[PDB]
Design goal:
This is part of a larger assembly, with one copy of chain A (186 residues), one copy of chain B (147 residues), three copies of chain C, one copy of chain D (126 residues), one copy of chain F (142 residues) and one copy of chain G (126 residues). Chain A has 186 residues and is an alpha/beta fold. Chain A has helices at residues 23-39, 42-51, 63-70, 105-114, 121-127, 145-148, and strands at 61-62, 77-80, 83-85, 97-99, 102-103, 117-119, 134-137. The chains are: A alpha/beta (186), B alpha/beta (147), C alpha+beta (45), D alpha+beta (126), F alpha+beta (142), G alpha+beta (126). Bound molecules: potassium ion (14 copies) and magnesium ion (MG) (3 copies). Chain D binds three RNA strands through strand 1, strand 2 and helix 3. Chain D: InterPro entries: Ribosomal_eL32, Ribosomal_eL32_CS, Ribosomal_eL32_sf.
RNA sequence: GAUGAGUAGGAGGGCGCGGCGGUCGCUGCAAAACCUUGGGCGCGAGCCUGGGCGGAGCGGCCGUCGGUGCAGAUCUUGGU
RNA sequence: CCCGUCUUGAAACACGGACCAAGGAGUCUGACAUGUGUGCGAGUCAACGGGCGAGUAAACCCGUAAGGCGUAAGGAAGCUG
RNA sequence: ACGGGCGAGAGACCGAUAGCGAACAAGUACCGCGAGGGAAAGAUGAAAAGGACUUUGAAAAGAGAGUCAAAGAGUGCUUGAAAUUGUCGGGAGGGAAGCGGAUGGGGGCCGGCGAUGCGCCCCGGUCGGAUGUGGAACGGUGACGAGCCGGUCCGCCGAUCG
């Protein structure tokens, strides 16, 4: 016998390929597999790793946030592995070079009208093979409804986790355990 | 999809994944929300604080239509303006766009966010917040009350 | 724009085709989407 | 046809994995079933009992699925299907499907002779 | 009585988004223009002049099946129809007695 | 392939009317391709007759040791009727091999399958000779 | 393709109707084609089989036989002809049932009703 | 097999990438994740191979 | 290169049955089913095939669906 | 050492099982929740209904200030935002 | 609105232990004082052509014979698994049998069970032979232009090889 945990084998699971059946995504994965193998670029490795991620792990980026992050770097190609959505709270749109998996129609129209371009990852490979002069961006991963329910249980002290309730109102989980006048608070 | 159900993988394993000792009996802990206070108290308290008891006053025969009050923010006011009106306003500084948020279906205007830079706006609404009115006045526009 | 030839029968008299290639002919081909939609809608009958 | 395979075929075990107690009860068939009983001596692997299959018995990958003649089997239902083996006659042999009639079997045999494709059951229905 | 007897209020139907339906239709139309995919789907198009196959509007006025067959022969789509006719056969299994023969 | 061959392969590698599969999806699985423009009848992107603009086709003509060598025209991809440039060779095996080499490799059409084309031509020639003169040896000695 | 909503394509219903058809419907169901000469003369394709009609068999073991019909067994869906018979083990002679669709009418027994039906059939064909 | 009239109507039915469809209110054809699916052209380009 | 125990339990990849949408085939020169100290493949679920019987249908492949896999339940019916 | 089972412990003087064939047990539905695939995206959802249409239970099209969910929350409430 | 009545159209439904209890003289036979309870049971053959006649037997039937493509389809008649039983043949057996692993004796089966080709020469027989010259159609690249390059087939002068 040998004193090893699980015979020395790994017990962690990570994505090694996309779970999607999108043929275009598969072609992009092949392209960036080749790029990673034959260039050893950290940017390419990050792009390849993110190409495997699930939908919730590729959150969208708003146009206003994209403009804010690109301020002072309009000459660099901003790259996001995800979707870019329009923001009606953004008034002035500068000329930007943007690469993403997908653009909403409004966001694409606004970028093109402002004078930028919307690029795919094949075009990004053609333009910056090693990711030179790029601004790699990620959307807000934890900014979703499901996350609010995670963490410490609502009923424990110092917890601000949202509870699961079928309706909102005075009669829905507000009396005992939420007030000093009805039993205890928190 | 039956062929993907895990019970198919458990064919020939006796307990069907529910254990030899514990087994899968009918209602080992009661039906529905039984025992909320007695043997499910820990669950109810830790996951559903506030569940037991009553608070506030009652309201017999309450109708929501008389409480209907949609709201919009000043950061979203500009989105209501059509593109042609928008560039007309940009070109001409002697006049300001006149937005009737009621026609788009809003009763009250709230003061979240900011407006376009150096743009006056005449906003007509049923109600408005103090901050929203202050922001409009600072932008150089005006507020009108209607019903 | 690419041009598509129009086949002419014996009965007809003019071989004038030259129809521009419609944009839908260059749409993305997604077997996964097609199979998903087909399998779901074939249940409706 | 000269088979391409060169490595000798080695079988780790040539005996069938017979289900326990299939000799005892007629209703219990021979096809393997892993015992799940709590006390089963076969499941516990008591020495002198029925052996259970495991991946350790796996055949060498180079010689896996190779017939004793040195080729691999491919079922053919017609002479048109036969032509698929034209460029693989040194690795693959053709076996005519059991339901093919004698009339079609004759044509398949003739075409295979033309193409230098080995038939495992060329004498059937003759 | 059978275990869990079948009931009529099983969810027979599906409600797919219209945008996804249109995506699928557009994809199928785009694929119909690829000769490789048309061949891969089992259609005999070796004699078709060009894909997409666009014919004169005079075909819309044809009234007789013989004239329709002649038009198919002229445009080179008749081998596919002949293959379809020759493939006519009785359905194997219980379906042949369920009004799908 | 009016669309890129890589996309065509991504679509058709899962299923197509020319794909022959046997013995399940385990270790016993056997796969082949039936399309006439696949030199080795192999279900792979390299030899695929559906996912390549430039394809070589070698088979036996009806009569008189005539070998059909056809190449897919690069520009007439949307014209199935005139998609193949055909040549029927009736001369000696040496001349046929020279023609195949010239039309496959010397023009950089598909140099990667020059060996496959030559092997297919040799197999077709041997099959024609045997079909003419009957079997005369078992070809079992090594 | 059927379009009338009051006709069924159900195999079960069609078989039930055919096998429970009364005698009047069975008469029409038991129709036979006319010979070439009668077809040309009357401009009619097929007629119900009558007792005193001359009939030539065109299918089966009696493909060349001909004679006068002697019985129309509607309950058994068959007709009997003059000399189309066979010998039993006893040695006695018994007529052999022949389906009307497998014979050809060479001469019709004509009456007022038969002539009227022939005229009606010819009128539609024109 | 398309008739000429149907082929012509295709453009007005399904619109295009730039403009919207007349027969489908506000519909626009989808765009792929890859502008050019010819993988060899990208992989063997001067930029990558340099 | 390292490594290999597994009840309760979880998961992955596969085998098998019957339909549906497609596709490729077999069959009176004999289909299904059944029978067989014939032979072979796979660790295995299983699969391919010789021979017989039978006398009219059946199968492979890609998706998709389900009243889909038995040694037990003093289990049910029938048979011995 | 006879399998299956309950059991700390079964070959058990523990229970079921004389034998064979066929049938035989985590299903369907509603409300949620995580995860994953797909479409769109500050929007999204035409299948209540209407116009039609494989002469048609399918498929296709249609949202007027319709509606649901989301886009603002905190208070018992007045109310503020 | 509509699991009743009359009349229709369909099905990703069941296929005789399934599907209504009932595919049949089924709410029948049968049971209970009664209210009630309630089965089992489909398939010769294309056509009865449903087995004449001889012989043995009291008879049922047997042995011959005849019909049919078939009786290896003979009226509870498409096919005919297992449990269980008889006969013949092989084998084993001091108070169980069966089973895992290794050989051996005997039997059974297997000819892709296990080859006879290849290279270099001589003789004879057939089929074709340039980088030359014309024709037919055509391709690679380029820009489904020019230019360059190129293969297949056919007709001739030389070459005299494969
Ligand atoms: K479980
Ligand atoms: K347990
Ligand atoms: K109150
Ligand atoms: K057994
Ligand atoms: K194991
Ligand atoms: K099939
Ligand atoms: K067998
Ligand atoms: K299936
Ligand atoms: K127990
Ligand atoms: K016991
Ligand atoms: K809405
Ligand atoms: K308060
Ligand atoms: K019953
Ligand atoms: K029989
Ligand atoms: Mg079922
Ligand atoms: Mg509304
Ligand atoms: Mg037996």
């Amino acid at each position: 016998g040998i004193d090893l945990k699980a015979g020395g084998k790994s017990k962690k699971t990570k994505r090694t390929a996309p779970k999607s059946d999108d043929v275009y995504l598969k072609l992009l994965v092949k392209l960036y597999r080749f790029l990673v193998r034959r260039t050893g670029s950290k940017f390419n490795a990050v792009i390849l790793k993110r190409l495997f991620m699930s939908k919730i792990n590729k959150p969208p980026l708003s146009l206003s946030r994209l403009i804010s992050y690109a301020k002072g770097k309009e000459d660099k190609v901003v790259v996001i592995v995800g979707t870019i959505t329009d923001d009606v709270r953004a008034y002035e749109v500068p000329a930007l070079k943007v690469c993403a998996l997908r653009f909403t129609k409004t966001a694409r129209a606004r970028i093109e009208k402002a004078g930028g371009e919307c690029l795919t990852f094949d075009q990004l490979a053609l333009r910056a093979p090693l990711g030179q002069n790029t601004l790699l961006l990620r959307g807000p991963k934890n900014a979703r409804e499901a996350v609010k329910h995670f963490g410490p249980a609502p009923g424990v002290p110092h917890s601000h986790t949202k509870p699961f309730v079928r309706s909102k109102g005075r009669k829905f989980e507000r009396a005992r355990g939420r007030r000093n006048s009805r039993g205890y608070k928190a | 999809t039956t062929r993907f159900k895990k019970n198919r993988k458990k064919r020939g394993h006796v307990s069907a994944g529910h254990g030899r000792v514990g087994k899968h009996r009918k209602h080992p802990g009661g039906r529905g929300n039984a025992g909320g206070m007695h043997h499910h108290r820990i669950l109810f308290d830790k996951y559903h604080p506030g569940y037991f008891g009553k608070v506030g006053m009652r309201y017999f025969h309450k109708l929501r239509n008389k409480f209907h009050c949609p709201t919009i923010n000043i950061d979203n006011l500009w989105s209501l303006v059509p593109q042609e009106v928008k560039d007309k306003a940009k070109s001409s500084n002697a006049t300001a766009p006149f937005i009737d948020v009621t026609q788009y279906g809003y009763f009250k205007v709230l003061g979240k966010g900011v407006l376009p830079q150096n743009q006056a706006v005449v906003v007509k609404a049923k109600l408005i917040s103090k901050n929203a009115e202050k922001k409009i006045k600072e932008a150089g526009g005006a507020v009108v009350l209607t019903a | 724009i690419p041009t598509t030839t129009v086949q002419s029968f014996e009965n007809d008299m003019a071989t004038d085709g030259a129809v521009p290639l419609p944009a839908v002919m260059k749409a993305p081909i997604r077997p996964d989407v097609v199979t998903y939609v087909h399998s779901n809608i074939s249940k409706n009958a | 046809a000269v088979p391409l395979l060169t490595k000798k075929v080695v079988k780790k075990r040539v005996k069938r994995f017979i289900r326990p107690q299939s000799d005892r009860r007629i209703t219990v068939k021979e096809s393997w079933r892993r015992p799940k009983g709590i006390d089963s001596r076969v499941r516990r692997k008591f020495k002198g009992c029925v052996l259970m299959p495991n991946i350790g018995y796996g055949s060498d990958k180079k010689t896996r699925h190779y017939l004793p003649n040195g080729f691999k089997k491919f079922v053919v239902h017609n002479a048109s299907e036969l032509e698929v083996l034209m460029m693989h006659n040194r690795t693959y042999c053709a076996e005519i499907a059991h339901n093919v009639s004698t009339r079609k079997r004759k044509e398949i045999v003739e075409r295979a002779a033309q193409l230098d494709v080995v038939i495992t059951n060329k004498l059937a229905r003759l | 009585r059978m275990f869990a007897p079948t009931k009529i209020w099983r969810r027979w139907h599906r409600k797919i988004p219209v945008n996804q339906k249109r995506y699928a239709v557009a994809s199928a139309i785009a694929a119909s223009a690829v000769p490789s995919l048309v061949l891969a789907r089992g259609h005999r198009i070796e004699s078709v002049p060009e894909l997409p196959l666009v014919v004169s509007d005079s075909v819309e006025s044809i009234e007789k099946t013989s004239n329709a067959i002649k038009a198919l022969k002229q445009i080179g789509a008749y081998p596919d129809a002949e293959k379809a006719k020759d493939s006519h056969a009785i359905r194997p299994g219980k379906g042949k007695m369920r009004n799908r023969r | 392939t009016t669309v890129p061959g890589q996309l065509v392969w991504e679509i058709v590698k899962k299923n197509n009317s020319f794909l022959v599969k046997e013995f399940g999806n385990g270790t016993a699985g056997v796969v082949f391709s039936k399309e006439p423009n696949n030199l080795y009848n192999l279900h792979s992107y390299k030899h695929s007759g559906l996912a390549n603009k430039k394809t070589v086709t070698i088979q036996a003509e009806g009569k008189d040791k005539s070998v059909l060598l056809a190449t897919s025209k690069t520009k007439k991809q949307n014209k199935p009727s005139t998609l193949l440039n055909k040549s029927v060779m009736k001369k000696e095996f040496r001349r046929m091999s020279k023609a195949v080499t010239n039309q496959v490799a010397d023009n950089y059409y598909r140099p990667d399958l020059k060996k496959a084309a030559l092997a297919r031509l040799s197999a077709v020639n041997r099959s024609l000779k045997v079909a003419k003169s009957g079997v005369k040896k078992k070809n079992r000695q090594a | 393709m059927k379009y009338n909503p009051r006709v069924s394509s159900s195999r079960r219903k069609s078989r039930k109707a055919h096998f429970t058809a009364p005698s009047s419907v069975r008469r029409v169901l038991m129709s036979a084609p006319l010979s070439s000469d009668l077809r040309t003369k009357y401009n009619v394709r097929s007629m119900p089989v009558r007792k005193d009609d001359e009939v030539q068999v065109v299918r089966g073991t009696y493909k060349g036989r001909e004679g006068k019909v002697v019985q129309v067994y509607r309950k058994k869906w068959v007709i009997h002809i003059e000399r189309i018979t066979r010998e039993k083990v006893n040695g006695s002679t018994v007529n052999v049932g022949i389906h009307p669709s497998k014979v050809v009418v060479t001469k019709l027994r004509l009456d007022k009703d038969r002539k009227s039906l022939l005229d009606r059939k010819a009128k539609g064909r024109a | 097999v398309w008739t000429k009239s149907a082929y012509e109507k295709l453009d007005g039915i399904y619109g295009s990438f730039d403009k919207a469809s007349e027969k489908k209110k506000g519909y626009v054809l989808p765009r792929p994740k890859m502008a050019n699916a010819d993988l060899a052209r990208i992989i063997n380009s001067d930029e990558v191979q340099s």
